[PDB]
């Protein structure tokens, strides 16, 4: 990792992260078989089997009763794209013609490939285990509705086989048909691995996804199609991470305030967050929660990306003179804060606040000068502002400093209005 401090605007850019971009959805359609449970009844009072049978029947019927601020824009587009893609395909499976086709596909074997009438191709999977137990064993055990049989082995076994079924209902019931993530129970490990291996992407991507399936699991979601006969039918949307190992970088910023004749003038960069370059264009990912890191890899959703002109990188080099309208916020009152970075921390420290850096060998090393300063994780273990304490990221790397007198000190601020929120820099300085 290479981290450059940009003292021209009190910002850091950390390069060398490797992209993992979602570029599609994959659909597996599951049938979960719960057998002829609704026929079974108990004539002989409370018992182990009656309680588990009651839970199964209750859970089964319960399903039938069921169903510019770039950071704001992008996350709306992202979730809209996700939900519509899921509902649009679910609405195509929900027809009775197709449910019979899926059941006809899976009738002999546990995995099948189906083309819906809407032209999409899906994998299909049968979770058949519970029907097999209810039909082949439990139904003959309960002769003549006598449920309180002497053999406990049926009762303990039944609690195991229905365990998965009850968990699926629990997740859908709490989420009104669209779950937030692919639980352990909607799709097992073996089912997930065998699903990913069929995705429409080359082996390089798939090998990564298999070694990282906890992230694939986290970003997908499931949709309930419904209960048909005594089979639960649900579908899972899996993220196709179709592009990997492109360059990415993160931008951080802090208030670049500086003072003349006793009056502060401030600037803060509003273009913070993730950027990734892909096939010769730059994508900006402003949502606070749609990129996540695991080492050098950053996982991001292409639907949350806003395209930016490639010249936009000039705000990281010579913002004082680029013609690209670099987004900044301007103001008169300085804020003191610590903006942490992967390899260090920006300390903004202004009037009436005391700031100092420390270590685990010795508690205090120095007290900082006023103004924006870059504290390096090799030079301190902790940094503190006004009795607050922060821990620096201990990861090794290399740091650079790009010298240049700060923008807020070089120009004179516009007399009215100050306090402009999210405007281009030309609108604040050299009026």
């Amino acid at each position: 990792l290479k981290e450059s401090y940009l003292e021209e605007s009190c910002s850091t850019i950390t390069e060398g992260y490797l992209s993992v971009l979602r570029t599609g959805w994959y659909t597996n359609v599951f049938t979960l078989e719960v057998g002829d449970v609704e026929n079974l009844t108990c004539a002989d009072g409370p018992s182990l089997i009656k309680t588990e049978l009651d839970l199964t029947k209750s859970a089964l019927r319960e399903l039938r009763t069921c169903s510019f601020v770039l950071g704001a824009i992008a996350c709306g587009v992202a979730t809209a794209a996700a939900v519509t893609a899921g509902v649009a395909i679910a609405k195509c499976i929900r027809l009775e013609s197709e449910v019979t086709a899926i059941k006809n596909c899976l009738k002999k074997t546990n995995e099948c490939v189906s083309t819906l009438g809407c032209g999409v191709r899906v994998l299909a999977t049968a979770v058949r285990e519970l029907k097999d137990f209810v039909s082949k064993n439990l139904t003959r055990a309960i002769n003549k509705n006598k449920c309180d049989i002497p053999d406990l082995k049926m009762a303990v076994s039944f609690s195991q086989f229905n365990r998965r079924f009850l968990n699926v209902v629990r997740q859908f019931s709490d989420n009104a048909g669209i779950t937030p993530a692919i639980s352990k129970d909607l799709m097992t490990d073996a089912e997930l691995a065998r699903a990913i291996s069929n995705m429409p992407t080359s082996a390089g991507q798939i090998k990564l996804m298999l070694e990282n399936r906890c992230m694939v699991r986290r970003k997908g979601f499931g949709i309930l199609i419904g209960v048909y006969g005594s089979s639960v039918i649900y579908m899972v949307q899996l993220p196709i991470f179709g592009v990997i190992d492109t360059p990415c970088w993160i931008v951080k910023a802090a208030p670049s305030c500086s003072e003349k004749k006793g009056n502060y003038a401030c600037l803060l960069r509003e273009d913070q967050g993730w950027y990734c370059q892909n096939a010769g264009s730059t994508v900006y990912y402003p949502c606070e929660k749609d990129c996540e890191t695991r080492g050098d890899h950053v996982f991001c959703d292409t639907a949350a990306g806003i395209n930016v002109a490639e010249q936009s990188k000039e705000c990281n080099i010579n913002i004082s003179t680029t013609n690209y309208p670099c987004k900044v916020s301007c103001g008169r009152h300085p804020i003191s804060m610590v903006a942490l970075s992967p390899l260090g921390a920006l300390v903004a420290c202004y009037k009436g606040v005391s700031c100092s850096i420390g270590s685990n060998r010795v508690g205090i090393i120095k007290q900082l000068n006023k103004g924006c300063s870059y504290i390096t994780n090799q030079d301190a273990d902790t940094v503190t502002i006004d009795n607050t304490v922060y821990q620096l990221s201990k990861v090794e790397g290399e740091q650079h400093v790009i010298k240049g007198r700060p923008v807020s000190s070089s120009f004179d601020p516009v007399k009215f209005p100050q306090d402009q929120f999210n405007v281009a820099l030309d609108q604040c300085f050299e009026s």
Partner: antibody, heavy 121, light 106 residues
Framework: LVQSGGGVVRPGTSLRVSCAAF????????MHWVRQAPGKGLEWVAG????????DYADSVKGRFTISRDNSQNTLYLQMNSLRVEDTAVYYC?????????????????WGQGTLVTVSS | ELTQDPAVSVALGQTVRITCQGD??????AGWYQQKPGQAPLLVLY???IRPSGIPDRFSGSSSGNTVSLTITGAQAEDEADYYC???????????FGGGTRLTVL
Amino acid sequence: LVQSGGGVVRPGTSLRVSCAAFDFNFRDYGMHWVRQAPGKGLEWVAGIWYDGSNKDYADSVKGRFTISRDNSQNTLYLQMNSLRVEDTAVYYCARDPRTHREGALSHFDSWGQGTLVTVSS
Amino acid sequence: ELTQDPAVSVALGQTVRITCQGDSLRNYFAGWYQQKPGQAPLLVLYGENIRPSGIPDRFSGSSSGNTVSLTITGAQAEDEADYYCNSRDNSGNHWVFGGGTRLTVL
């Protein structure tokens, strides 16, 4: 799989080896032909996608064989012309698992029983 | 073009790794078949260590770089067969089979 059409002919003639009576739904699956000369290793012969597009062939046959399918009767055909002596082999009918043609999978399953085609003087 | 060792032997109950080598395995997964004499090939492994249902849990796969290998744990006498790898070439259209390994169990 009721595979037929396999016998013996003098070289320079034509024959057809059909593979039908599929237990799975023959539609929606891609299909492939693989052959095995007596005692020798396997050779891929031809391929077809589920809608009948993407007919493709190994260079040993690129000019001569044709691979065809009927999704209404559930039958797969490989029709041989200018049959040459080296074409003597067991022909197997095999299934393609892939959902999407861009996928990375490259195995076959559901191998049929063999259909021995012989060529002799 | 895929490539294989022509023959390999294993002591009963000892393990053995068959290996298949070819430039295209970087992009496309392999499928592993076994062929006992006369019978049609039977898929024994595919992908990165996925078994078809019914294949006993002794077979396991591994891969790296441009190489794949099939590991037979606890090699039983019924494991004596030809083993063939196949994969697509860099065209993405043409399949290729390895020359097959005639494993034998002592």
